[PDB]
Design a protein around this ligand. Structure first.
Ligand code: ATP
Ligand code: ADP
Ligand code: MG
Ligand code: MG
Lengths: 208, 72, 121, 52, 140, 281, 177, 104, 52, 70
């Protein structure tokens, strides 16, 4: 704790200059209670915990939204409506986390309608927290998306109120902002509507 | 007021009348068969009027001897 | 912690033994209720050849009945017909007619006032 | 002061501080190097100062 | 019963108890399968409920009071009174008294020739059904 | 729910980032709002002991305690993470000895040992290097006596000795809610109460994330404000019923209206106990 | 006169305009019927289809040469191409004939429809066959039913219905072989 | 677990043991009330596998009666304390042994 | 839960052949013939491949 | 070899092996690799890429393949 602490206390903003540090912290055997990850948690202003269970769902970046904390998530710092959208998203994701065992053994068809409204909303904000990165274009093919801060607050404000209950879940998956879930849904609906007769090959009888 | 057969002018529907004629037939079978047809004579359900949207009254029913022969 | 999974194990070991018992009581109920459905299926069809079958008629008053189950561990049965109940109570309603909604089974009243609150009687 | 990153889950639920210490936790192929390359791509090119 | 073993006990016991303990090992085993199944007593098959009723007849027969060990010829007949018929009419609450009725009422000279021969001979097997019929079971 | 008297030791135990420091900072800020309305013999002088934290975090608190005005009553003893392990081991005792000035002279103190988990980590380090043989989780044998001889200095003294008090708020951080760990079980044994904050309640919007079932105060309602004590019993009982009606609340189709009476009576109370931070009431 | 042509397949095209398309069009009880009423056929000379139906049981779905039904005007008999008729039945004995043997069920009362295509449909509630009636309790209830004199019309309507079921039941258990 | 129900003293009835529970020592009338309460409380623990996920409608009044016998027994094991008068506003109760056998 | 005649006509020989294999895997042993009387049989590999 | 692999994956993703049953595709793409002309394996090995002159020509040579069962 003092080897780590004597190092981490040098990485600070002083009054003469600033150091914005981003440091990756490996967890051994995916264990967060291991003493080398657990000691590093105290030294950080913002924490971004990446999970393997989230990544195996295909959600990338695999950020655990119920383990990632910041001292900037404060209504006096980021604003009132940014803070309320953020705490509203975490409440839908926590309520769906509480329903995971009974959905696993009883199924979707046994919850309340109030419960299965938030199951469908949390399945929407789970996919919508994912995003194509510009550095992942080399092995994914999907172009990256720099989402502005205003585009993700009002994009996530719409999902909590219910403006997009009628959209499918996969329209939220790997898009930039809330305009692109509407374009991907139109594209998704069209691809099961676009169908052609005799496919316009013109491949045989191609002259020279 | 109403015009019809002897059950219809007495305030009795056809389903109440024709089950009474089935109720009174099952009683006069053999006890190998009367105990069999005793099973299909029992009426067990409940009903409650729902006036406002979720408030009701609940008219719980109960009868093993068949249709209520009295005027309801 | 290492007992928190030891108590979670014995809990799920009994759920998988309880719901194996509820499955076999539902399979023994289904086999002797199947022998009564076909004997009840006979009397239905002399009426629908004497009176036809006219679902989309211009009534001015209706009683729609959605008959559901009582217990609610049946798995997508009682909400399936309330999807169909609103699919017909939006199909008949083109003329401003009266509708009284009746449900049979506790899982019907608990899901019809979720969609249709005022004409439920 | 906030550090906008362009990442939806970061800017919403745990926003980074401009001048603060950020940690990215995860183990053995969850993507904490792909995430740190994206913060290099998004934050550092529009930063102004020097990187190490 | 499901976890207690005796790996020598396959033909290393009383031959009189070995007549009936092999069946009690089967009836308690099928009851052990369906015990935590049919915790409820509402909706039961006509076959699995009989295993659930016989197995609860055998469980109460096996329990006994402290500091009173029984001779082997007197616990052979109380398992024989439960492995056979003779006890499918007391509910669950009387079988502690119903086996005490069997030890009291049955002619105690079957105990002198069950213990001497060591097994249930067919001569004694005839008298054992007859002696277990004139008993007054406290199911009343 | 968990009332605290002058002189008791109330543990704040929880996971990381669940409101442990915020509960204790609200306790210090509130004394500034109550010190101006009481006479000199009723005032509480707080001491915040920051063991193993950053200097960025402590400078945030000194900026906060100066903006509020709590610094004229507060001592801040700060052995941060860059400091030597003997300095972080001794800073709870250094802070208590400063706070024992107010206990011994008839005034009232409030000592807050933030990260008492991080003191025992510093004490384990200092003891494995002195070659004293390790025990469970490599901690020394006397890591109970490390914390019991610290916490038992928080006492309400008798009137022969001035009648002063020291109230301790030790803060222990758990790992994934595991309070069966070695240092968590030691300090739960020592302290009177425990304010157990929980990270799934924190993300249900319940903030401060207090687990009402596991939270206890040994002193109890012997040192509660009357009037609050009149209304807390029906608050304690209705939340006791609202918790057992839960794990049945997944079926809002199944109305009962007697269990659903308390399923929303308790939820009025659960929403009542939420509170924004840095604003004590 | 025929201004609203409703029907099972006509319900389909309106329901494909006001319901969500992910639901298939719901079933109708006419789809589970192999025999209609108006379509030509099903007489076969002498042997027409008769369907004896109770709610709890099906008694016969074979073809018969004639059925003798106890109407409210009296016991009538249906031959093959009988006139289409909707006949309310009394408590009486239905006699399904095919040749030398005959099966005679005493019914409690309930309609019988001969259709325009020769299909006869007996639809009673309780069909007690004549071998299983208790001929000692027919009189024990008829004595009290002839003596119970209520002034409210409901029980008398149940009392007039009581005696006429029993009186036709003694009258159909005496003179048989 | 007993204290999360609010039952005080939170004595586990199916984990507390005495050598005095021989019927040779306390007599068989006390012994069968003690063994009967432990029997009826072990049964309720065996039935919470069902009635804590389903809701006491699948028991056909057979062991519905043993729940509401055991649920009254769990509260009747609770007792106000003279020294818990200063915690909770209810007076202390000292119960005689002959009275707690008959009441149970 | 359902019954013997419940399943298909193609699944009845799948019960019949498999119950016929389960007996055919049994074998009397030459060492056990002293206390079970019947002699034991060494089955060659060529017989049990072709026999099954 | 990699060219006899990418022809086989071309034969299954471009629908040429559809309606072949799932229990003879090991025989069916053995038929694809054995019956298609060897020159499209050598052109694809050398170009490294299915050129527009080749996917036109390889679609032709996959139409004339005796798949089992049909
Ligand atoms: N009642 C509350 N309402 C809203 N936000 C709160 C509340 N209590 C705490 N927080 C927030 O929770 C975050 C976590 O800080 P906290 O006060 O939990 O420190 P802590 O538990 O000591 O954290 P650490 O894990 O650093 O030890 C802070 O951003 C704080 O603003
Ligand atoms: N944003 C992302 N989009 C798609 N795939 C990703 C993303 N992040 C990680 N991955 C997958 O996870 C793998 C490992 O990521 P990496 O950054 O190497 O993690 P680590 O450094 O923790 O081992 C990458 O090869 C990539 O396939
Ligand atoms: Mg890496
Ligand atoms: Mg802290």
């Amino acid at each position: 704790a003092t080897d780590l602490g004597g190092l981490q206390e040098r990485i600070t903003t002083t009054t003469k200059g600033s150091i914005t540090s981003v440091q990756a912290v490996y967890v051994p055997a995916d264990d967060l209670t291991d003493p080398a990850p657990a000691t590093t948690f105290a030294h950080l202003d913002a924490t971004t915990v990446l999970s393997r269970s989230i990544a195996e769902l295909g959600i990338y970046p695999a950020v655990d939204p119920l383990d990632s904390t910041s001292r900037m998530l404060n209504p006096n710092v980021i604003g009132a409506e940014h803070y309320n959208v953020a705490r509203g998203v975490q409440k839908v994701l926590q309520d769906y986390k509480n329903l995971q065992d009974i959905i696993a053994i009883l199924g979707m068809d046994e919850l309340s309608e109030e419960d299965k409204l938030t199951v469908a909303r949390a399945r929407k904000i789970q996919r919508f927290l994912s995003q194509p990165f510009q550095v992942a274009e080399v092995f994914t093919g999907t172009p990256g998306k720099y989402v502005d801060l205003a585009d993700t607050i009002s994009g996530f404000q719409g999902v909590l109120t219910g403006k997009y209950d009628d959209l499918p879940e996969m329209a939220f998956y790997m898009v930039g902002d809330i305009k692109e879930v509407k374009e991907k849904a139109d594209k998704m609906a069209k691809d099961i509507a676009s169908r052609k007769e005799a496919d316009n090959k013109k491949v045989s009888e191609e002259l020279k | 007021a109403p015009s019809g057969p002897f059950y219809r002018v007495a305030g009795m529907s056809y389903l109440r009348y024709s089950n009474i004629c089935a109720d009174l037939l099952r009683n006069v079978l053999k006890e190998p068969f009367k105990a069999k047809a005793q099973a299909r004579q029992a009426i067990h359900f409940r009903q409650a009027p729902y006036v406002d949207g979720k408030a009701g009254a609940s008219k719980v029913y109960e009868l093993e001897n068949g249709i209520p022969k009295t005027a309801n | 912690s290492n007992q928190a999974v030891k108590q979670r194990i014995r809990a799920i070991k009994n759920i998988g033994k309880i719901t194996k018992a509820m499955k076999m009581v539902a399979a023994s109920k289904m086999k002797n209720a199947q022998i009564a459905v076909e004997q009840s299926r006979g009397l239905v069809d002399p009426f629908v050849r004497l009176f036809g079958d006219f679902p989309a008629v211009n009534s001015n008053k209706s009683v729609v009945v959605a008959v559901t189950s009582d217990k609610g561990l049946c798995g997508g049965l009682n909400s399936n017909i309330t999807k169909y109940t609103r699919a017909t109570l939006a199909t008949t309603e083109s003329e401003g007619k009266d509708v009284v909604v009746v449900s049979i089974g506790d899982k019907g009243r608990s899901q019809l006032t979720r969609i249709e609150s005022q004409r439920y009687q | 002061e906030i550090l906008v990153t362009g990442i939806k889950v970061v800017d919403l639920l745990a926003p980074y501080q401009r001048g603060g210490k950020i940690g990215l936790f995860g183990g053995a192929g969850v993507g904490k190097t792909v995430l740190i390359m994206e913060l290099i791509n998004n934050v550092a090119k529009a930063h102004g100062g020097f990187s190490v | 019963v499901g976890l207690s073993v005796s790996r020598v006990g396959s033909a290393a016991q009383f031959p009189g108890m070995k007549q009936v303990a092999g069946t009690l090992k089967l009836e308690l085993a099928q009851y052990r399968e369906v015990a935590a199944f049919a915790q409820f007593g509402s909706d039961l098959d006509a076959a699995t409920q009989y295993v659930l009723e016989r197995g609860a007849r055998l469980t109460e027969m096996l329990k006994q009071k402290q500091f009173a060990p029984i001779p082997i010829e007197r616990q052979t007949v109380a398992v024989y009174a439960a492995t056979k018929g003779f006890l499918d009419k007391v509910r669950v609450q009387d079988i502690v008294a119903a086996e005490e009725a069997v030890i009291s009422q049955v002619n105690p000279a079957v105990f002198k020739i069950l213990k001497a021969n060591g097994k249930i001979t067919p001569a004694l097997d005839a008298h054992l059904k007859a002696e277990l019929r004139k008993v007054k079971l406290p199911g009343a | 729910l968990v009332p605290i008297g002058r002189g008791q030791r109330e543990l704040i135990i929880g996971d990381r980032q669940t409101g442990k420091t915020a509960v204790a900072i609200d306790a210090i800020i509130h004394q500034k709002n109550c010190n101006e309305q009481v006479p000199k013999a009723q005032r509480v002088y707080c001491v915040y002991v920051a063991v193993g934290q950053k200097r960025s975090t402590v400078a945030q608190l000194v900026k906060l305690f100066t903006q509020t005005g709590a610094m004229r009553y507060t001592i801040m003893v700060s052995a941060t993470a860059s400091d030597a392990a003997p300095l972080q081991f001794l800073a709870p005792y250094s802070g208590c000895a400063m706070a024992e000035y107010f206990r011994d002279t008839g005034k009232h103190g409030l000592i807050i040992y933030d990260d008492l988990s991080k003191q025992s980590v510093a004490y384990r380090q200092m003891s494995l290097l002195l070659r004293r043989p390790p025990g469970r989780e490599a901690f020394p044998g006397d890591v109970f006596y490390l914390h019991s001889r610290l916490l038992e200095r928080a006492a309400k003294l008798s009137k022969e000795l001035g009648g002063g008090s020291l109230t301790a708020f030790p803060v222990i951080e758990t790992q994934a809610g595991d309070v069966s760990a070695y240092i968590a079980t030691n300090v739960i044994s020592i302290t009177d109460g425990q304010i157990f904050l929980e990270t799934e309640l924190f993300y249900k919007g319940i903030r401060p994330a207090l687990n009402v079932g596991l939270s206890v105060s040994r002193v109890g309602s012997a040192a509660q404000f009357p009037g609050m004590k009149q209304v807390a019993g029906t608050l304690k009982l209705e939340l006791a019923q609202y918790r057992e009606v839960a794990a049945f609340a997944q079926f809002g189709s199944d109305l009962d209206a007697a269990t659903q009476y308390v399923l929303e009576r308790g939820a009025r109370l659960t929403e009542m106990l939420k509170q924004k931070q840095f604003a004590p009431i | 006169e025929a201004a609203a042509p409703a029907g099972p397949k006509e319900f389909t095209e309106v329901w494909n305009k006001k319901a969500p398309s992910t639901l298939i069009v719901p079933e109708f009880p006419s789809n589970y019927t192999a025999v209609k009423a108006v379509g030509e056929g099903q007489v076969h000379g002498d042997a027409f289809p008769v369907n004896f139906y109770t709610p709890h049981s099906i008694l016969s779905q074979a073809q018969k040469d004639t059925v003798v039904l106890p109407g409210v005007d009296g016991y009538f008999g249906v031959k093959a191409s009988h006139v289409p008729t909707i006949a309310q039945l009394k408590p009486g004995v239905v006699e399904l004939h095919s040749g030398a043997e005959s099966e005679k069920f005493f019914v409690s009362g309930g309609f019988a429809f001969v259709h325009p295509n020769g299909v006869t449909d007996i639809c009673v509630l309780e069909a007690a066959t004549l071998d299983q009636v208790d001929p000692a309790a027919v009189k024990s209830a008829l004595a009290a039913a002839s003596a119970a004199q209520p002034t409210d019309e409901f029980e008398q309507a149940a009392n007039r219905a009581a005696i006429e079921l029993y009186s036709a039941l003694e009258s159909a258990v005496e003179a048989k072989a």
